[PDB]
Amino acid sequence: SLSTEATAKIVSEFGRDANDTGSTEVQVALLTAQINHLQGHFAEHKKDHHSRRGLLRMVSQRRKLLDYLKRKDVARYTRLIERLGLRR
Amino acid sequence: MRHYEIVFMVHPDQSEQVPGMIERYTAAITGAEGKIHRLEDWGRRQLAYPINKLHKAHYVLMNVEAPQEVIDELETTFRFNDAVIRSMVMRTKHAVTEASPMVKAKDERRERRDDFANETADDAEAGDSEEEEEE
Amino acid sequence: PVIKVRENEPFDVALRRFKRSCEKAGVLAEVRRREFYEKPTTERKRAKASAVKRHAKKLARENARRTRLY
Amino acid sequence: ARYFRRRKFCRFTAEGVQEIDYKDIATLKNYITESGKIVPSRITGTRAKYQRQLARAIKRARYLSLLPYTDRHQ
Amino acid sequence: AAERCADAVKEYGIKNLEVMVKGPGPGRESTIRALNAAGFRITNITDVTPIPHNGCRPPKKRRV
RNA sequence: CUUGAGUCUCGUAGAGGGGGGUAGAAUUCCAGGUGUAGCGGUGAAAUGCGUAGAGAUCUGGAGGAAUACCGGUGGCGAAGGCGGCCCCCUGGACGAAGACUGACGCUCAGGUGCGAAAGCGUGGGGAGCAAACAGGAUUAGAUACCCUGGUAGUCCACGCCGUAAACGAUGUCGACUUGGAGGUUGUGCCCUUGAGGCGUGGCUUCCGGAGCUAACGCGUUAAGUCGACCGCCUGGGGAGUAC
């Protein structure tokens, strides 16, 4: 769950190029910001197993693109975990 | 903020006691950096069935751009008000660039398109005058 | 049953084609029966398979037209 | 030449352009029975997209207690 | 029954009717025809069968 | 590397979900008027309802459940499934065009969640229908079909094992591909070719060559051809029963 201007602000200062919409890192930053809002939606909409399934799909994909980034170089993958705050 | 449209109703006894309300609602929305995109009074209308054992009530329409919390607050205020006797609210709406477009259909409801449970003659002396060449 | 009407006090005007609401009308199918979410379209295709006397005459009209033999 | 003779809510941009609204109660009277029921696509001269919009506006207006909704009333 | 009902109100000096109908039964036009022919005045025919917006679950008889 | 795969911009339809609200219609129930002896249920009634005032008709009040039309082999959802109207929040899809990333992909034992109905623990609720229970009828009998009567149940909130002709019977995913017509629906361009057409892209109903094909048929969305991975069968009963 994300506003269009919020999505825009994510790629404003992430992305590997002018009008990048495809880089691994920004895909995973926008997926984090979706997850964090959608977890907070399904918190009160406890029987919405549409949103639950959409939430699952997002965190799975984000984990597979974190894995793709750790497959490239591990230091940028842990830099993204730094830059998004994720896990303890 | 969001574009809206609002209908609401008050009693027949209140069909000349509504302009003081239309003032207050205007001042709430302009107070909120919101604007009136259209304003119409549909007058006393006859009802296909009586609401609260009376066959007519008085209709108004506002069409606005306003912050969503004004329209949260006001639709619920109506839903707690006993003088305001029924509403409808619609999301994401603007006026026609025509003036009085709904008035010409108010004219039609009051003429051919109800079951007239109380006489046509008392309710039709309310709200916007049906100058059909504007609308 | 009798509606309201353009008819001359209908019992004397032999109109029959439309003059019901439920009474041998299509909404009688779940009226006086259980609710069944699926049944009423399945029940068209199933009924027709036993309803062979009307079926076969319409079938004969269209296939005989379609051959240029009619 | 240009333009050619269009059919009901067909071949054209400025009819049925926006969705059929419940405030426009004047058009809705055209499309209802003597028991205040909806008329289908096959009679109205319109397709599925417009019928969905029509049947909504009719519904809205009836629950506003402004249009007939059965053969009976008080 | 329609004739016996015309006789039932005979004493109130009524003669003019209009007509209202409900129910699936066939007592709906033979009644009117013999009523108008039994010295009474039929003038209007309107149905008053009540119909719902879906409503409550119908009964089942004979597994119909 | 961008072609597979993924992502945003942007166009767009939808009974997709969760939370809340609302209008009118109706079956029921209560009170009372009016009226007066009938009513009801079946093949027949009987049981049952009435004169202690029924039925029918009028008006006031009360409850709980559900949305007639629209409606289509239509539209949407992972499937299970999803149908009155309003708001709030919200997943998914599809598509004319813009680009971007740079094979990041695909399946999947085990695992984890979902999963019609019935069910059951918990609390609430009790209009309608109706397991159980009670009575009636029928019949040779009738513990049944049929009728009179009717509790639980359903519906609301919370929690639990989960099963189904979960029969679109065809594991998931992909490429290859005879033809045609209907519906539905996104789109560029234009004499809206006439009708909007036409290409084009998505879904789906129907038909069908060839192929496949015990057979019905199926049949380019194959019951086809080909690849990866994963599940099932191996005579019948014992038996998904036992342990």
Ranges of each domain in chain D: 8-73
- The whole-angstrom separation of Cα D25 and Cα B113 is 8
C18 touches chain E (CB under 8 A): no
Question: Would you call D70 and E51 a contact, using CB atoms and an 8 Å cutoff?
Answer: yes
CB contact under 8 A, E22 and C12: no
Taking an 8 Å cut-off on Cβ atoms, the answer to whether D71 and E53 are in contact is: no
Q: Which domain holds residue B88?
A: 1-92
Nearest CA in chain C to E25: C23
Q: Tell me the two tokens of residue D6.
A: 């269009």
If DSSP states are collapsed to H, E and C, what string results for chain B? CEEEEEEEEECHHHCCCCHHHHHHHHHHHHCCCCEEEEEEEEEEEECCCCCCCCCEEEEEEEEEEECHHHHHHHHHHHHHCCCEEEEEEEECCCCCCCCCCCHHHHHHHHHHCCCCCCCHHHHCCCCCCCCCCCC
In sequence order, what DSSP letters do the residues of chain C get, joined into one string?
---S-SSSSSSSS---SS--SSTTSGGGGTTTS---SSHHHHHHHHHHHH-HHHHHHHHHHHHHHHTT--
The minimal CB distance from C3 to the residues E47, E59, E60 is found for E47
Mark the nucleotides of strand F covered by protein, meaning any atom under 7 Å from a CB. Answer: 5-10, 13-19, 21-27, 41-43, 57-61, 64-75, 77-79, 82, 84-92, 98-102, 104-105, 113-115, 127-130, 145-148, 158, 183-186, 191-196
Query: Between the CA of A30 and the C1' of F205, what is the distance in angstroms?
Result: 41
Q: Which of D70, D73, D74 to mutate to test the interface with E (most CBs of E within 10 A)?
A: D70
Chain D residues within 8 A of B107 when measuring between CB atoms? 26
Q: Which of E22, E46, E51 to mutate to test the interface with D (most CBs of D within 10 A)?
A: E51
Q: Give helix then strand counts, H and E, for chain A.
A: 4, 0
CB D4 within 8 A of CB D11: yes
In this structure, what token pair is assigned to residue E22? 């409900």
E and D touch with 3+ CB pairs <8 Å, answer yes
CA distance D71 to D66: 14
What percent helix, strand, coil does chain D show, rounded to 5?
35, 5, 60
Between CA A42 and C1' F11 the distance (Å) reads: 29
Distance D16 CA to F189 C1' (A): 23
Give this entry's resolution in angstroms: 8.2
CA-to-CA distance for E23 and C20, rounded, in angstroms?
A: 11
Measured CA E8 to C1' F74 distance, in angstroms: 56
Using CA atoms, how far apart are residues B110 and B120, in angstroms rounded to an integer? 7
CA angle in degrees (0–180, nearest 5) for B112-B124-B97: 80
Separation of alpha carbons B74 and B118, rounded Å: 30
- Contact: D23, B45; criterion CB under 8 Å: no
Q: How far is E26 from chain D (nearest CA, A)?
A: 20
Look at the block and give the residue holding tokens 């008053």.
Answer: E48
CA at C35, C1' at F125: how many angstroms apart? 22
Is any Cβ of chain B less than 8 angstroms from the Cβ of D29? yes
With vertex at residue E41, the alpha carbon angle to CA E35 and CA E47, rounded to the nearest 5 degrees, is 70
Question: Using only C-alpha atoms, what is the Rg of chain D?
Answer: 14
D44 to chain C nearest CA, in Å?
19
Size of interface C-D (CB pairs under 8 A): 5
* C35–E57 C-beta distance less than 8 A: yes
CA-nearest of B25, B17, B18 to B71 is: B25
Q: What angle do CA D60, B58, B25 make, to 5 degrees?
A: 90
Closest nt to A6 (CA→C1')? F8
Residues of D with CB below 8 A from E55's CB?
none
Q: What's the Å distance between residue A63 CA and nucleotide F176 C1'?
A: 34
